[PDB]
Structures are given as structure tokens and as C-alpha cells.
Design an enzyme around this catalytic site. Structure first.
Site, PDB file in Angstrom:
ATOM      1  N   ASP A   1     -18.423   7.264   5.210  1.00 25.58           N
ATOM      2  CA  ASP A   1     -17.135   7.941   4.273  1.00 25.58           C
ATOM      3  C   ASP A   1     -16.885   7.523   3.076  1.00 25.58           C
ATOM      4  OD1 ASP A   1     -16.599   4.715   4.201  1.00 25.58           O
ATOM      5  OD2 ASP A   1     -15.355   4.268   5.187  1.00 25.58           O
TER       6      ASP A   1
ATOM      7  N   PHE B   1      -3.183   3.202   7.410  1.00 26.77           N
ATOM      8  CA  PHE B   1      -4.805   3.817   8.221  1.00 26.77           C
ATOM      9  C   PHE B   1      -5.829   4.006   7.782  1.00 26.77           C
ATOM     10  CE2 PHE B   1      -5.766   6.988  11.198  1.00 26.77           C
ATOM     11  CZ  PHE B   1      -7.034   7.267  10.670  1.00 26.77           C
TER      12      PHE B   1
ATOM     13  N   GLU C   1      -8.091  13.914   6.160  1.00 31.84           N
ATOM     14  CA  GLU C   1      -9.610  13.703   7.132  1.00 31.84           C
ATOM     15  C   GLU C   1     -10.714  14.072   7.559  1.00 31.84           C
ATOM     16  OE1 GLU C   1     -10.542   9.498   6.917  1.00 31.84           O
ATOM     17  OE2 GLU C   1      -8.159   9.157   6.178  1.00 31.84           O
TER      18      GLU C   1
ATOM     19  N   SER D   1       4.386  -2.362  -5.896  1.00 33.20           N
ATOM     20  CA  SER D   1       4.573  -1.613  -5.225  1.00 33.20           C
ATOM     21  C   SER D   1       6.020  -1.113  -3.904  1.00 33.20           C
ATOM     22  CB  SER D   1       3.367  -0.818  -4.733  1.00 33.20           C
ATOM     23  OG  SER D   1       2.183  -0.569  -6.223  1.00 33.20           O
TER      24      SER D   1
ATOM     25  N   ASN E   1       2.894   2.279 -10.396  1.00 31.30           N
ATOM     26  CA  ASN E   1       1.810   1.133  -9.804  1.00 31.30           C
ATOM     27  C   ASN E   1       1.364   2.122  -8.876  1.00 31.30           C
ATOM     28  OD1 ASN E   1       3.163  -1.056  -8.362  1.00 31.30           O
ATOM     29  ND2 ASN E   1       2.946  -1.859 -10.346  1.00 31.30           N
TER      30      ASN E   1
ATOM     31  N   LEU F   1     -13.516   4.318  11.680  1.00 31.65           N
ATOM     32  CA  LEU F   1     -14.433   3.480  11.288  1.00 31.65           C
ATOM     33  C   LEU F   1     -15.230   2.583  12.407  1.00 31.65           C
ATOM     34  CD1 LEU F   1     -15.962   1.520   9.480  1.00 31.65           C
ATOM     35  CD2 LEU F   1     -13.755   0.265   9.512  1.00 31.65           C
TER      36      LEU F   1
HETATM   37  C1  LIG Z   1       2.170  -0.693  -0.614  1.00 29.43           C
HETATM   38  C2  LIG Z   1       2.403   1.103  -0.371  1.00 29.43           C
HETATM   39  O1  LIG Z   1       3.214   1.165  -0.361  1.00 29.43           O
HETATM   40  O2  LIG Z   1       2.137   1.103   1.805  1.00 29.43           O
HETATM   41  C3  LIG Z   1       3.085   1.945   1.014  1.00 29.43           C
HETATM   42  C4  LIG Z   1       3.481   0.830   2.406  1.00 29.43           C
HETATM   43  C5  LIG Z   1       5.149   1.059   2.490  1.00 29.43           C
HETATM   44  C6  LIG Z   1       6.410  -0.169   4.052  1.00 29.43           C
HETATM   45  C7  LIG Z   1       5.012  -0.725   4.848  1.00 29.43           C
HETATM   46  C8  LIG Z   1       3.764   0.198   4.821  1.00 29.43           C
HETATM   47  C9  LIG Z   1       2.839   0.732   3.439  1.00 29.43           C
END
Ligand SMILES: CC(=O)OCc1ccccc1
Ligand SMILES: [Cl-]
Length: 162
Positions: A20, A104, A11, A117, A132, A32
Site C-alpha cells: 500500500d 476503512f 482502492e 472534525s 479541519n 491489509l
Molecule cells: C473524523 C471523520 O470525519 O470521520 C468521519 C466519521 C464520522 C462518524 C463516524 C465515523 C467516522
């Protein structure tokens, strides 16, 4: 390395209101302020957050305190979310940092489209999850940031940040 050092790298630090990558008013270490196009609304949000009349400028101490609150808020959002918490609890410490990083940046709603994912991460299918995760607006709009975070999920190491 830890989550604070990782996000500080991703950041940066600016002590005056800036925009941003999406054009939103921001300050400090990626805090933000508002999605409104009005600089005056952003300045009002800043004064409310800091507790004094800032006129758009903060100190390094103030930026670091905001950052600590924002990281805390991201972790709390994960822990209170029934979809995210089980995945988070299944990850090792390094990969947990990649998870906080994404929350974040995008928030709990920004990660809502990543259902597939999340399942691959929970199953520890790291290479499959990496592919993915890259098929996303996130990767296409901020590819260098996304590559660092994805590499952290893929390897479980800090090598992308070294
Ligand atoms: C979608 C992703 O890969 O976010 C990672 C993640 C995994 C567990 C909890 C929050 C975010
Ligand atoms: Cl980027």
C-alpha cells in the site's frame, strides 16, 4: 453509488500481494495483511484469511468476499464506538459512506485524532469540517483520496466520484 462502489474506486483491485502507500503488504480491494516487513508473514496471514494455501494469489471471488467482510467490520467498529456512533447516526446516507471510507482506510485508532472534525460534522458545519479535515497527515499523504472523501462530506453528493 454505494459504499462498495466508492471503496472499489478508491482502492482498486489486485489479486497478488502488493504494498500500500505506506509500504504494508496488502491484497484484493485494500485488505491489509500485516505491517510486518516479512513477505512470509504476509503469505501466512493470507492463507489464514482465505482458508487455503494461496502462495500469495487469490481469485476475484475471494477478493470480493474479503472486501464484504472488511466493509462489515468497518461499520461494526463505528457502531460499537461511543465517540463515533452518535456522529454516524446524525449523518445522511451519502455522508455515512464518507465516514465508512475513512474508517476503512485508517481504522478506529487512525480517526482518534479527529475529535474536532467529528464535532463539526455532528453540528452540520460542513465547510468548517472540510477545512479541519484537510489539516491532517491523511490529507498530506493521500491528497486525491482525501479530497474525494472531504468533498463528499462537504456536499453530501457523489460528485467527486462522478
Ligand atoms: C473524523 C471523520 O470525519 O470521520 C468521519 C466519521 C464520522 C462518524 C463516524 C465515523 C467516522
Ligand atoms: Cl491519493
Amino acid at each position: 453509488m454505494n459504499i462498495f462502489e466508492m471503496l472499489r474506486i478508491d482502492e482498486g483491485l489486485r489479486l497478488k500481494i502488493y504494498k500500500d502507500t505506506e509500504g504494508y503488504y496488502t491484497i484484493g480491494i485494500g485488505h491489509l495483511l500485516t505491517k510486518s516487513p516479512s513477505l512470509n508473514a504476509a503469505k501466512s496471514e493470507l492463507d489464514k484469511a482465505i482458508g487455503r494455501n494461496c502462495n500469495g494469489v487469490i481469485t476475484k471471488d475471494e477478493a470480493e468476499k474479503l472486501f464484504n467482510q472488511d466493509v462489515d467490520a468497518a461499520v461494526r467498529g463505528i457502531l460499537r464506538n461511543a465517540k463515533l456512533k452518535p456522529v454516524y447516526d446524525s449523518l445522511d446516507a451519502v455522508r455515512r459512506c464518507a465516514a465508512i471510507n475513512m474508517v476503512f482506510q485508517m481504522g478506529e485508532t487512525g480517526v482518534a485524532g479527529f475529535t474536532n472534525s467529528l464535532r463539526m460534522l455532528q453540528q452540520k458545519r460542513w465547510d468548517e469540517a472540510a477545512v479541519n479535515l484537510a489539516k491532517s497527515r491523511w490529507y498530506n499523504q493521500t491528497p486525491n483520496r482525501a479530497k474525494r472523501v472531504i468533498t463528499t462530506f462537504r456536499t453530501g453528493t457523489w460528485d467527486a466520484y462522478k
